[PDB]
């Protein structure tokens, strides 16, 4: 990468108002013991007892390529989906001019990973300058907190090794 | 609808799949505000189901429309089942591919 710069697409405080964006934390994630998560996400949980239709753009004005991640939960009972989106029927979708996809939660019961019974996918997209990008879901949304205004440099690899700096 | 290839060679069948902006433009274009398409034959089976959702403006265009393509052995059929939101084919082609070649992009005459 010859650029590569990370911002706050979509900033903490003042994007959700209508959703809980505090207590998007858990045990599998720990932080010096404290539920914790990751910092360029943000889990999105029902505010009371609601959940409204999340619609959320960004226009791409770096004049590079910006990288955005977001996540789609997929809950392991549904009395698990009630207790954080308060919908027993979701559904995401997230769309560009290059990118466009919907997204239905799956319901069911793994075995434990790391003391989970549910999963959670993650994706990615690179932005085109000077293009929109949309989001909307109806609950189960890891919602982008950061994004990467970058200009990838030309082939290169990576090398796993022991070997120091 | 169905059809039986009979050209004694392979026929190249490509056909669409519309997914509207709003269920206001779902229903304007198809009546019916859930629907499925299937396309089926021997080798080749898939259901569609349209995802209705607002996408950025692409030549002024807020909704999406995927295109498919599949081949058709000679002698075997494919069957085509839609409620809705389903760009069937007008034109085939009944081809038959040679050895292994390319394609050249570039400004020089012929």
Same mark, same amino acid.
């Given at each position: @990468?010859? +650029?590569?710069?990370?911002?706050?697409?979509?900033?903490?405080? $003042?994007?959700?108002? /209508?959703?809980?964006?505090?207590?998007?934390?858990?045990?599998?994630?720990?932080?010096?013991?404290?539920? #914790?998560?990751?910092? /360029?996400?943000?889990?999105?949980?029902?505010?009371?007892?609601? &959940?409204?239709?999340? $619609?959320? #753009?960004?226009? /791409?004005?770096?004049?590079?390529?910006?990288?955005?991640?977001?996540?789609?939960?997929?809950? $392991?009972? #549904?009395?698990?989906?009630? +207790?954080?989106?308060?919908?027993?029927?979701?559904?995401?979708?997230?769309?560009?001019?290059?990118?466009?996809?919907?997204?239905?939660?799956?319901?069911?019961?793994?075995?434990?990973?790391?003391?989970?019974?549910?999963?959670?996918?993650?994706?990615?997209?690179?932005?085109?300058?000077?293009?929109?990008?949309?989001?909307?879901?109806?609950?189960?949304? @890891? @919602?982008?907190? &950061?994004?990467?205004?970058?200009?990838?440099?030309?082939? $290169?690899?990576?090398?796993?090794?022991?070997?120091? @700096?």
């Amino acid at each position: @990468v010859s +650029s590569f710069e990370r911002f706050e697409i979509f900033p903490k405080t $003042s994007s959700w108002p /209508n959703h809980d964006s505090n207590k998007g934390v858990t045990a599998a994630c720990p932080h010096a013991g404290a539920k #914790s998560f990751y910092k /360029n996400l943000i889990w999105l949980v029902k505010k009371g007892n609601s &959940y409204p239709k999340l $619609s959320k #753009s960004y226009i /791409n004005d770096k004049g590079k390529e910006v990288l955005v991640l977001w996540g789609i939960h997929h809950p $392991s009972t #549904s009395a698990d989906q009630q +207790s954080l989106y308060q919908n027993a029927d979701t559904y995401v979708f997230v769309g560009s001019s290059r990118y466009s996809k919907k997204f239905k939660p799956e319901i069911a019961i793994r075995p434990k990973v790391r003391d989970q019974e549910g999963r959670m996918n993650y994706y990615w997209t690179l932005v085109e300058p000077g293009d929109k990008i949309t989001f909307e879901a109806t609950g189960n949304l @890891v @919602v982008p907190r &950061y994004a990467f205004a970058m200009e990838r440099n030309a082939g $290169s690899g990576i090398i796993i090794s022991d070997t120091p @700096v």
